[model samples]
Target chain A: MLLKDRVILITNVEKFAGHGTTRIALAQGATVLAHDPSFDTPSARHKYESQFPGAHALSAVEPAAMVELALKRHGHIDALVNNDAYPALKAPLGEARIEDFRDALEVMAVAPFRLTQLVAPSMRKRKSGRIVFVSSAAPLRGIANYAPYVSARAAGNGLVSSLAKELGRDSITVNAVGSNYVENPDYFPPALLANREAMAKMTAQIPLGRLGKSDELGATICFLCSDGAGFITGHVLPHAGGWA
Target chain B: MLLKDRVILITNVEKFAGHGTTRIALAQGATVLAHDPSFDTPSARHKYESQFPGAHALSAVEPAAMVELALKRHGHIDALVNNDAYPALKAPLGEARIEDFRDALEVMAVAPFRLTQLVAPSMRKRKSGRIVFVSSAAPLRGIANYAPYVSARAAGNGLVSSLAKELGRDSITVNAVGSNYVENPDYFPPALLANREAMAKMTAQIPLGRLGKSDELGATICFLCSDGAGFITGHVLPHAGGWA
Candidate 1:
């Protein structure tokens, strides 16, 4: 119950790493406002409710509406996990489309910024909050073919750096967790893992010799959200299983 | 001439990444105030001058004196590169010495913080400056036996995160470059590289398949020092050759 009595707002909460983050937060006794575009669907809402009762999963893509719902329902947000990413559209810088890059920025950078700005004022009033951006280790590796995704995430990461100090005096901490080779059905599907060549290629880069378990990521996020990490503000922790 | 006419103060300028940074800053036409404890020696001063003439390899290491020397000789510092580290003393957390941890924090964290604090006011007055810390990528890997060094660097990295926002309003940017698997003769001597099994085991962890060239790091540092990277602040850019 590391997050007991905590009310956390998580964006894109029904997909990718957001799904893992939600379950982890719930397991630790925190109430979650799971805002995801997919929550508009009956099946998505049904699945989420069946999986985690008492959690609020809603279709709130617009940043303003998301903030309003959190305030209306919970009155305050104890922490925020900006846990989502743009599509990894592969293209060399020379051939990359301006539109794809713009789209990447819209989803990865702008949306997170808008949401954080909306929640920050209320958090300031209370003088305590935790914000975590679900960024990637791709930027660290400077990997090829994912220029748009990497660049967008970097912008979001830089925003976290800027806000940590601005909000530090209010007792609001901002940090990011950059993960790579983590177990996720959205990215590393079972078929991909079954392919020996693909598995070998990826595993060669990680010193720990395996893809990361989702609970490992969940636990780290939970720790950052808890009072235990009070002094750690504005850090980008690499949850990469030594992949970095 | 990326850094032409810029005055840069670099700590431990005769050792670690400081030596490489001095060469790069010189090539970019920046005037470097190279503060090093070893600069007290005639031979060390002579060697540094021979390596990078016109650079000031001074022995002013006490934080206040170091700041005064820069102000006295250069009028103002356009950049400060924190480029030194504690000895990589190996121990498990249980066996780690309290004294060694304290010394690590003193050198790797406290000294850099003190110097950054000293130089920050001048940079804020100018409304333009860059501060880069030559931190480590070891912490990203969470390797065992190097707790002291890793923890201290983490503290410094967290400082960069906090100050980017604190100083951004003044038009000053602070960032860090974390490096590992880099080719520094002091850390990776010829004897170590010659050990076939050891070298292979280490290189296997890096996707790029080799140690990072010294210039690769220097070039990244130089870019951050220049106006080209004006928008990037509070970043911990890892120049680890896919080893981060």
Candidate 2:
């Protein structure tokens, strides 16, 4: 509800948990450019467009297009939310290819970088904008054999903080929300889930005594984009269930 | 003086701010390891070694040899500081070269990772260790044309946070000290300094005028490594004179 009347751009909107975020943004009256990488179901597209009208479900990697569409439709972008990439890959850095590294970097790091750059001019001109990157918690805890995701996530975090420094003067807010609860997605193997007893046991690890709800992230995202978050920038707002 | 009796391993010793930190570490009673990836001058080596008989100098990138030397000599490393890299190279992603990226990754990121892996067994056994990564303001506020450096620096920050989370149970504190104002040997061209002086004329831009001293960073590192900082980990301690 905090994003009411805001023109929001969200990337990787086709991803599992990411869908919930878009739904929340739409409910808040944000005309979201809910982009997917290579996969947006026609059904989902129809659903989103019906709700938000101008929401574009397309390639999130095209930074130029992402910015252009936002400007063309909204006349100016008020906020950008970058939520990209899958959860994990079971290969350490030594075993992972440089190509894999670059691919992850492109989607996770470069896309955000380019998008932020395009939005910067307008944001600086207007002296107002909200940028939120949905970064991961794997890099914070060093999940095993997941170097590509971890390295790229780190880059994303750095980019967000770095941008906060550059853009804060213009009344722009840049911050990252790092979430890794069960609601983040089913990134774990079936065996692990079985062993963990359907997240009942896993939720115990969280002081909150339950797995996170996707809508919680959505709500947090809304708060970050709201007037409430104007003074808070360059923060790694970890949705860590007090694990931090 | 906080590191009394702690055995510390550091990379790129000779090039350290006129080697002031080494003397300071020795004065603090830390058994310092002067880690280098390449050659170091003899006179400087002799001066440090004689000043603190416990001080050591060796290469850290050669993995097995580095680990062997560390274990064989120190028998126990209470802390390891991953510092030193190429000056500045933060350019846009496409403009940065693949090789520079690779080298930067290896020297800056890989060494720290590999060293942690090597040192983990001993530190975990001792139930005490502190890992300090010397990063930069560039990672947080990335400098253009410093692409490779940015990637590596970000990686270093990521590694520190990751390691901190994983190693905390073992009583190892992992953190990063990012430099905002470091007066060093590489600083040249009085023209750029003059430009900064001109820039400083706009005092609102910088909350605190003037650059930072290395001792400030050294003192921070000294504090983080102390028992007092045991509760602090996975933090990017900034010293940018409030600019960031």
Candidate 3:
């Protein structure tokens, strides 16, 4: 119950780190207002609502509307987990499409900025809030054939660093969990996870020689949103099994 | 004459690290193909051409045309210095406009990527070349109210890392000079330079307690492009006098 009674808002909560954070935050006594593209449909929203009883799944992915809904529901948000993720469109530099690169930036970089800007006012008024971006560690060291994804994620890292300094005076903390090699089906699909040789080769690159569990990343995000991580700001805590 | 007879292409060569690199590389006996927006005018072009006798100042700033001009002149490019820069539009997150951010990305990230992609083929064919980005160190540690600029520069840093791995097999190296607190008129103009109190406060933050000279950074960029730096790739060498 580290985040006991804290109102946490998480985006893209249907899968990946978003899903992991939703579950952990709920378990930690957080009043979770979760948003996902899937929540737009009745059946999907019903399924998520039933699966996670305590969490409220909102049907808004647009930054303004989502933040408005959260504020309307909970009065004020205690923390915002910007857990947006996208597919790694891997291609050689010469072959990579400029459209795809721009698309990645629109979602990962621009959207995150919109969300952060919308939420900052409430946090500033309260003089306390936590902002955590579930970013990738690939950009920390750079990954071959993944320049677009790496560049976009690196933008989020840059934003986290800048915002931390800007918001520190208001008692707000901004940090990112630079995660990779974590057990997320979005990146490491079930088919790839089932391939023994592929998994071994991937695990070998990690210094810990193992893939990280989703909850492991979730727990780290959870801790950042807690009072214990008050002093840590303007930092990208690597959650990649020592990959970075 | 460390770079004697080497053909080097440098972008935005009128000021900042670009000016420094151009001067030093020329002094080191490299044949410099320099591109600057100012070169579009005859007077500015004449000023540059007359000042630096051997360096060829090109009017083209468009990525494709710029690379083509360099390749046409030299027949082959030994190195490329992506030294694009933009003003530090300092604004709070709430005050920052989306258009400015996109513009920054266009000049500092997308343009650099396009240039790198265009020049890479020549390097790959020869099985040896150097790509150096004159990026900023602000993103390395994160600067407040400079998110747009920092985010864009971080993209170049990301590109350097990924391109390093992608181009290593072809015997091409990719690196960036992450610089800050450097003596350049673009960032630290004459008025700010003369302000003793302001200068003292800025200098106190740097471990070395002084601003880095433009030529010092240029020397570093020159070294990375030389045969001596063949083994060092995928690194953002901080030249910020320990500010980062």
Candidate 4:
């Protein structure tokens, strides 16, 4: 029960690390405000809410609205897991559309900033909070043909650094999980999982020689958001199984 | 003559690593297009131009206009050094204005991307070029109270990674100089230089136990922009005296 009675707000809980985080946070005794755009209807929210007794589903895309809803329901947010992700669209520099680049920045970088800004004041008043962005390791090592996604993720990492320093005095921690080669359906789908050759080629690049389970990354995030991780801030811990 | 006959575009040549890079690039027999916002007057440009026979000063803040001027003057740009920097403003996360963050991104990250985008086509056509961004090490190991600057520099580094892979096939290498604790009057001025106690305190954090010379970093940038560094791309080489 690392997160016992902690109020955790996690974004994009429909899939990937967010889903794993939501599940684990709940198990660890957190009142989880799990948000996803897919939870648009009342029944959809209810279905997710019913799946976990301590969890609440939120559908708002706006950072202000989401923060407001979470505050209204939970009174205070002890932790914020910025787990939103954009599709890694591959394109040559010459052919890459500026619109795609702008869109990626909007979703990953700007949205995270807005959310953090909205939450910072409340955390400051309490003098304790944890912020963890589920960023990619692609920017850490510069993956090919995914400049938009990589750059946006890099911005998130930068936010972690600056915010960590800015909020450290208030006993707030800001860090990022720089992840890659993780087993998530959005990035590593069932079709790709079925192909042995493709999987082997991908795993070969990873020093660990295997794809990482979402729960493995989730555990890392859980620890970071725990009371034990108080000393760690402004760090981008690579959860890429030694890939980065 | 590591850069013999190469045409290198170095930004913010008025000071810092850009100044040292221009000096070294010229010494290495390369023609330098030195850009600085301060070169607004003809005499200022002429003064700088006269200081180095191989150097030409240009005053254009707009990335598109700067690229155009460089292309028009040099026919082809062999390398580009995105060395623009902003003052590291310190503030608490709660007190930090969104305007400052936006301004930092505009100057450091967005401008570099725009410049790189403009130069890519020419490099792709020639099948060879080098891109080196003089970014900071602050984001590499998050510094306190400078979130906007760190985030912007991180964005530049991200661009380096994505662009490196996207342009690798064309023989165009992209890299960044992750620098900190360097001897620059802008960041470490004469006032700070006069204070031995402050200097000792600052140097204590650096593993090398000294501030790095701009020429040392300039040499690193020159190498990255040279033919010798062809195999190295997508690297954020730390020139921070091991501070990161």
Query: What TM-score against the true chain A does chain A of each candidate get?
Result: 0.94, 0.84, 0.97, 0.95
TM-score of each: 0.53, 0.71, 0.97, 0.87
- Which of 2 and 4 is the better model by DockQ? 4
TM-score of chain B of 1: 0.94
Candidate 1, superposed: residue stretches over 4 Å from native: B1-244
> Stretches of candidate 3 above 4 Å error?
none
DockQ (CA atoms), all models:
0.02, 0.20, 0.74, 0.59
Q: Provide backbone clash counts, one per model.
A: 1, 12, 0, 0
On a 0 to 100 scale, what is the lDDT of residue B84 in model 1?
66
Model 3 chain A: ten consecutive residues of lowest lDDT: A57-66
Place model 2 in a CAPRI quality band.
incorrect
Worst 10 residues of 2 chain B by lDDT: B184-193
When sorted by TM-score, best at the front, the candidate numbers are: 3, 4, 2, 1
Cα TM-score of candidate 1? 0.53
lDDT of each: 0.76, 0.68, 0.88, 0.83
lDDT of 2 at A218: 84
- For model 2, state the Cα shift of residue A20 in Å: 1.7
DockQ of 4: 0.59
The digit string of per-residue lDDT tens for model 2 on B45-75 reads 6665786576777644476677678778858
Q: Select the stronger candidate by DockQ from 1 and 4.
A: 4
Q: Which candidate has the highest TM-score of all?
A: 3
Q: What is the fraction of true interface contacts found in candidate 1?
A: 0.00
Score candidate 2 by lDDT. Answer: 0.68
> What's the iRMSD of model 3?
1.0
